[PDB]
Structure formats: C-alpha cells, structure tokens
Amino acid sequence: PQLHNGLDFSAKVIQGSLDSLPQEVRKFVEGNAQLCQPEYIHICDGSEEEYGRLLAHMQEEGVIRKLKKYDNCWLALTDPRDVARIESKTVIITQEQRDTVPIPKSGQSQLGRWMSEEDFEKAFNARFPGCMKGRTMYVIPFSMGPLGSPLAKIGIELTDSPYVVASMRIMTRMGTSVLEALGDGEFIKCLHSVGCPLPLKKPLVNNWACNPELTLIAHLPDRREIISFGSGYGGNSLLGKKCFALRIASRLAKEEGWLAEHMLILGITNPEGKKKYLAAAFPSACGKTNLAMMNPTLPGWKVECVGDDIAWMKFDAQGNLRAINPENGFFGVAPGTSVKTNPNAIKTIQKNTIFTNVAETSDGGVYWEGIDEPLAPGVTITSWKNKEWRPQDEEPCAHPNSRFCTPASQCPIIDPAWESPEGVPIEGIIFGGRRPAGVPLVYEALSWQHGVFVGAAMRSEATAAAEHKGKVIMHDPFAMRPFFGYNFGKYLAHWLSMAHRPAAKLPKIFHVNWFRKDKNGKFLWPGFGENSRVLEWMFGRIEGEDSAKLTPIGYVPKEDALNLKGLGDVNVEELFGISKEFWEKEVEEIDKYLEDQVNADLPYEIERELRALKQRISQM
Ligand SMILES: Nc1nc2c(ncn2[C@@H]2O[C@H](COP(=O)(O)OP(=O)(O)O)[C@@H](O)[C@H]2O)c(=O)[nH]1
Ligand SMILES: [Mn+2]
Ligand SMILES: [Mn+2]
Ligand SMILES: [Mn+2]
C-alpha cells in the first residue's frame, strides 16, 4: 500500500513483471530501485533475443565493439583505472572481527579485511543513494551450479551495467527458469553499480563507467548480501564469481559441512581405460586454466575439463569427496594463450566470446602478448588503450589482466559430466605456486594433516591478478588468501575435520612447482602439455604404486619413476634438489607467518606438522 505514487516501480519496467517475481525477490528489487533511483528496471530472462538487443545496445553506446573476424565475438576496452580485482577495497562485515580473520598477534591481518556494520552503513550511505539515476537496473537471476543440483545456490544480481549482464549470462546460469526454480526459497542478494549516475559529472574514459575513488566490494554473510560499487571489471562486478562462489560460499560451506575452494577440476584417463578426477588449487595467473585444458603429450592419455577456478565439494553417503564447477563459463587471462600453450583455449574462444582489454587487429581479430601467431601483411593492431600500436613501443597491446569470457560448453575437452548435478569423485588434490627456487617439481604429503599443512604453507611470487607488483614471494594458503569467507584458523580446522568423517575416502595431496628456475633464470621444466608426465606419477600413486621416495618434505618420485622420454636434457639434479639451507629458512618464514596471522586460532595439528617438518629438516 501507499499514499502517493513513489513506491510502485511497475511503470519503469521495460521487460518483465514485478507481479511475476517471488515475494522476497520483488521486495529486494523495489527496495533498491527506490534507493538507487534507476530510470528503468529490466528483469532479465536469459533469452537469446535479450542477449541480442543487449549487445546491439552496447554497440550503439560505444561500450563494446564487434570482432568481425569471428562468430559473435566482442571487444570491450575498460578505463585504465578499472582493469582488475581490487583486493585492498574488498571487505567482510561481521559483528565480531574474529569471525572474519584471526586477530594477528602483532601487525595487520593478511587473511581478510573486516569492517563493522557501523563503518559500512556510513560508506554505503555515501555511495548508493541515487547512483543509478538515469540508468537501467537489470535484475539478473542466476543459479550457481546445475539447476536442482543439491550444492546449487541461487542469487539475484541488481546492476546498472549491460556489460555485466552479458558476462553473467556466460559465467552463470541466468534467466527466467532460475526464477521458477527459486520459487520462495532463499537467495543471495547481490547489488552492483558502476557509480556514475547521469548527468555524468566525470567524463568517461573508453566509454567505461566507473568510480575508482569510491570503489568498494563488501560482503555481509550474516545477511547473505553482496554490495559492490564503483567497478565493472570481472571479480568486482560478476558478483557470483569471487564474492559469491568463494567468500560467501566458504562461510556457508563451513556452516553446512561442505567446501568452497579456489580449485580447478579436471578428469584424466590412462591407456588402460581407468579415469580419475583431480583438483588443483593454484594462485591466480599460476596455471589452473592451462592445466584444466591441458593438451597432454603422453600417448593414450586424455584430459577433460570440468572447471578452471571454483570447486564446491562435499563427501557423499558412500564417503567419496564430490566436486562440481558452479560456474557456466571461463573467465581466463588472455596474454600467454597461444596455440602451443593452450590450444584447447583457442578452439573455445572463437565464437560467442566477449574479450576485455585485448588488442584488435585491423581485419577484425584479437591480439595479445604471447599469442605466438604471425599476422598477415598489412594487418595493424590497435592496443587496449584504443591507439595505433606497433611492436616497437614498450606499451603492451594487450593489458596483462585482459580477459576472455567464453561459454564452458564450447570447450572441446569439456568433461561429459561438468554439469552432472552429482559431481565428480575427487581422488587427488594439488597445491602449487610460483616458486623460483627451492621447491621441487612435485612431492606427496605424508598424511592428511601434513597435506592440510602444505596448503596452508603455500607461497608464490607476485603475479598480475590483484594490485600486487614487484618480484616478491608472499603467502597464499590454499590459493584462497583473497577469498577467505571467515576466520582462517577455523578454515584450517574445518579441513582437518574431514579426517574425522566416517568412511571418508580422503584424496591424496600433492604439491607441484611448474616454475622452478636455475642460476640463469631459465625454467627447469617445459610444463604445459608436459605436465601430463607429472600427472602420470600422481595417477600411479593413487592406485598404490611403489614409485615414491621418502624425503624430509614428503614423498617424491623414485629414480626413473617419472616418464621423461622425449626430453633427456632435463636437469633432474636441480629440478628435485632439496637443499637443507633453503628449507631451514622456509620453516622460519612459515612459522613466523602462522604465529602472527593465525595466532591463537591456529589448530595444534598444524603446529605439530610445522614442528615435525622443522625436525626432519634439522636431521639432514
Ligand atoms: N612456465 C609455465 N607457465 C605457465 C604454465 N601454465 C600457464 N602458464 C603461464 O601462466 C599464465 C596464466 O596461466 P593460467 O592458466 O591462465 O592461470 P590461472 O589464472 O590459474 O587460470 C599464462 O600467461 C601462462 O603463460 C606452465 O605449465 N608452465
Ligand atoms: Mn581465480
Ligand atoms: Mn583462469
Ligand atoms: Mn585431527
């Protein structure tokens, strides 16, 4: 009911019906409509027509270009200030700070950024009021994971960005069928605005609406709400990805007894007809996608891709660890993707694919550094800065974090069960990062507890995923440092608890290092398709083959255990060297880190593994 005409936004609905919305769905829409004051409200139905008019609108607004060389592929150049995931402006709001991050013994926590409700209410009220003035509010109903799937959760994103709606149509399951499945069930409330209400008081660079100064990505797990403002780029705007699928989901999984992890999922089959499913957690820009879509070099081996970034896992009745990719597409980095590195990626992005900040060729194609592909005579390149670009300038034509957004179904090696609502049984878990020195190519954990300790001890050099720069090695336990939904100590404890479940078929735990270097700065391992040689060893260890040698850090392959045929020139000495001098410093850094950051919430079993490892190393 109302006394005037200031609460019923029906007259602003250009597609859909507020009447057809579930009870709580309508309230969430009209409430923020009244707060944000959008000129129009557009309730997405996921249709091809919608996608069609949507793209055409963005092309008439100078938002995106059409890549005439490919089938239904589009380019989008963003503002140079809004070109990646802002880790420093992401915050989690909990009544108690301890719920979010362990109280550091001395210094600032690196495992999350907490903000009180009082501080957030101020920041919120200073951003969203009237932020969509003169823009359309798109209502994105999307399901994470297959519909009806048990570990499938539904969210509603409100956004004033057509670029976001198009991307979300690729990355999630979006449309009207999601509304009907939801019914009156619960859902995740997602609110996004670029923060440039009209009239534009700030000119737009590359026609990219954004507000860097006021950027803020907030999470409220107690309320099941995600509030993002000022950014339109991937992690910040695609709220169902990082914000939902990891941070909020991790909190839920802790509550509900499953797991939400920053892991690729791949299935692998050997020449004997036996197939196994593995999961790998690497930091961003550390090889997950190239591994999940690997083109193996060992004959009789087949790799299939279930997912490349997010895994939702839970033990089933039979005690197996089951995993699903809750996403619907791939949002991978562009540069370095060549036919020689990730050819399966090339085959996927040639249609229905949206690119961001990659270079455009004068004939209607894409270009980026490392594409490893000569262009024809008379073909010019326009950089992502929208300027004539030549290979003689220092300006790279493709931004380091530039992306492609492609449907998962188009992948030629997509696993025939990536949408199976029952998941895939994970028999192995892989950790790793970019360690230039010290860490051997691969080793196996001595037990679950040691495994959990290995994940927690992961470290890697600074890449181009967040705002980190320089050549520095920092901690990234479980590859989840930027995405922990709650206290990390309680995270570790949650993992260790899996060893207590009845008839729990705990998978093996490996640590790989694709990036060990020599004294000249030369990679000691070709990697990519050759990583199938490392997976071969893992496959045999899962079946119980006496191919492992015991060492102070874990099991490593025996002599002549790794199929190295076709190489011969690989320096195996330095590739597996376990220097005591290096590992005595490694334990010190891990100790100091764990004592400071996890402090009084560090489980004792992790402290015991730390103690045990320090002991085995001193006996060298
Ligand atoms: N040396 C080496 N580099 C790799 C390998 N796989 C990927 N890369 C590089 O890492 C960058 C990002 O890899 P990607 O698979 O997209 O990482 P993701 O973010 O985890 O999906 C690419 O530019 C590649 O050049 C590998 O096996 N060996
Ligand atoms: Mn990721
Ligand atoms: Mn990726
Ligand atoms: Mn225990």
Query: How far apart are the CA of 288 and the centre of ligand 1, in A?
Result: 7
What gap in Å lies between CA 601 and CA 486, rounded to an integer?
12
What does the buried/exposed string (b/e) look like for 413-449 if buried means 16 or more CB atoms within 10 Å of the residue's CB?
A: bbbeebbeeebbbbbbbbbbbbbbebbbbbbbbbebb
DSSP 8-state code for residue 94: -
Q: Which residues pair with 139 in a beta bridge?
A: 43, 158
CA distances from 202 to 22, 123, 244 (A): 37, 20, 30
C-alpha span between 537 and 442 (Å, rounded): 10
Give the residue, by CA position, lying nearest to ligand 1 atom 25.
Answer: 336
Q: Of 304, 411, 303, which is closest to residue 348 (Cα–Cα)?
A: 411
- Tell whether 521 is in a known binding site: no
- 529, two tokens: 């398709």
**CA end-to-end span of the chain, whole Å?**
78
Say if CB 357 and CB 384 are below 8 A apart.
yes
Contact indicator for 27, 53 with CB cutoff of 8 Å: no
H or E element, residue 102: none
DSSP result, 334-379: -TT--TTT-HHHHHHTTBS-EEES-EEETTS-EE-TT---PPPTT-
Separation between Cα atoms, residue 367 and residue 396, nearest integer Å: 10
Which of the 8 DSSP states describes residue 242? I
Q: Which is nearest to 47 in space by CA: 166, 137, 159?
A: 166
Phi-psi region of 575 (alpha: psi -120 to 50; beta: other; left: phi over 0): alpha
| Cβ atoms within 10 Å, residue 41 | 24
Ligand 1 test: best mutation among 290, 368, 369, most atoms within 8 Å of CB?
290
Number of other residues whose CB lies within 10 A of the CB of residue 593: 17
Q: Whose CA is nearest to atom 12 of ligand 1?
A: 285
290 is in an annotated binding site: yes
Shortest-distance Cα residue to atom 28 of ligand 1: 527
Distance CA 576, CA 548 (A): 13
98 is in an annotated binding site: no
Maximal C-alpha separation, the chain: 83
Residue 487 marked as a ligand binder: no
Ligand at shortest distance from the CA of 482: 2
Residues 6 or more apart whose Cβ sits within 8 Å of residue 581: none
Question: Whose atoms come closest to the Cα of 529: which ligand?
Answer: 1
Nearest-ligand number for the alpha carbon of 284:
1
| DSSP 8-state symbol, 241 | I
Q: CA dihedral in degrees (554, 559, 565, 571; nearest 10)? A: 70
Cα(84)–Cα(237) distance, integer angstroms: 10
Residues 145 and 506: their CA atoms lie apart, in Å, by 23
Question: Dihedral (C-alpha) 385, 391, 392, 395: value to the nearest 10 degrees?
Answer: 30
Look up tokens 């013994």; give the residue. 105
Q: Is 386 annotated as a binding residue?
A: no
Residue 269's CB is within 10 A of a number of other CB atoms, namely 15
Taking the centre of ligand 3 as the mean of its atom positions, its distance from the CA of residue 576, in whole angstroms, is 27
Domains of the chain: 9-62+86-257 (3.40.449.10), 63-85+328-412 (2.170.8.10), 258-327+413-620 (3.90.228.20)
**Ligand 1 pocket by C-beta < 6 Å: which residues?**
282, 284-290, 308, 332-333, 335-336, 341, 514-515, 523, 527-528, 531
Q: How far is the CA of 58 from the centre of ligand 3 (A)?
A: 26
Tell me if the bond preceding 199 is cis, omega within 30° of 0.
yes
Among protein residues, the one with the nearest Cα to ligand 1's atom 20 is 288
Rounded-to-integer distance, Cα 617 and Cα 620, Å? 5
Which ligand lies nearest to the CA atom of residue 603 in the structure?
4
3-class secondary-structure state, position 49: helix
What is the distance between the alpha carbons of residues 488 and 216, in angstroms, rounded to a whole number?
Answer: 22
Question: Near ion ligand 2, which residues have CB within 5 Å?
Answer: 284, 309
Which tokens sit at 38? 């959008």
Q: What is the DSSP letter of 105?
A: S
**Chain mean position to CA 276:** 23
**Token reading at 136:** 């359309």
Ligand 2 centroid–CA 309 distance in Å is: 5
**For residues 331 and 405, is the Cβ–Cβ distance under 8 A?**
yes
Question: Measuring CA to CA, how many Å separate 247 from each of 92, 157, 186, 190, 251?
Answer: 9, 16, 18, 13, 7
Residue 13, Cβ neighbours under 10 Å: how many? Answer: 18
Residue 528 CA: nearest ligand 1 atom is: 27
- Does the annotation place 584 within a ligand binding site? no
Distance between CA atoms of residues 249 and 261, nearest Å:
9
Q: How far apart are CA 327 and CA 174, in angstroms?
A: 11
- In the chain, the amino acid numbered 538 is M
Task: Report the C-alpha gap between 83 and 106 in whole angstroms.
Answer: 33
Find the 464 Cα to ligand 4 centroid distance in Å. Answer: 37
Q: Please, what sign has the CA dihedral across residues 604, 605, 606, 607?
A: positive
Question: Which residue matches tokens 């990062």?
Answer: 433
- Cα–Cα dist 37/34, whole Å: 5
Cα–Cα–Cα angle for 482, 483, 484, rounded to 5 degrees: 110
- For 589, residues 6+ apart whose C-beta sits below 8 A from its C-beta are 459
400 and 465 Cβ atoms separated by less than 8 Å: no
Overall residue count recorded for the chain in this entry: 620
The residue behind tokens 């550390």 is 286
The ligand 1 atom at the shortest distance from the C-alpha of residue 283 is 20
Alpha-carbon distance of 47 to 169, in angstroms, equals 9
Among the atoms of ligand 1, which is closest to the Cα of residue 514? 28
**Residue 179 alpha carbon to ligand 4 centre in Å:** 42
Determine the Cα–Cα distance for residues 328 and 308; give it in Å rounded to an integer: 11
Ranges of beta strands (E only) in 59-145 are 65-66, 74-76, 90-93, 114-115, 136-144
**Would you name the residues annotated as active-site residues?**
286
Q: Is the dihedral of CA 44, 169, 418, 511 positive or negative?
A: negative
Say what the resolution is, in angstroms: 2.2
Q: Please give the Cα distance from 446 to 443 (Å, whole number).
A: 10
**For ligand 1, atom 23: residue with the closest CA:** 336
Angle separating helix axes 580-597 and 604-618, nearest 10 degrees: 160
Angle, to 10 degrees, between the axis of helix 448-456 and the axis of helix 488-497?
160
For residue 288, say whether it is annotated as part of any ligand binding site.
Answer: yes
Distance between Cα 501 and ligand 4 center (Å): 11
Q: Are 552 and 582 in contact (CB under 8 A)?
A: no
Q: Technique behind this structure?
A: X-ray
A 10 A CB-CB count for 65 gives 18
**Which alpha helices (H) appear in 228-323, and where do they start and end?**
234-237, 249-256, 288-292
Closest-CA residue, ligand 1 atom 11, reads 285
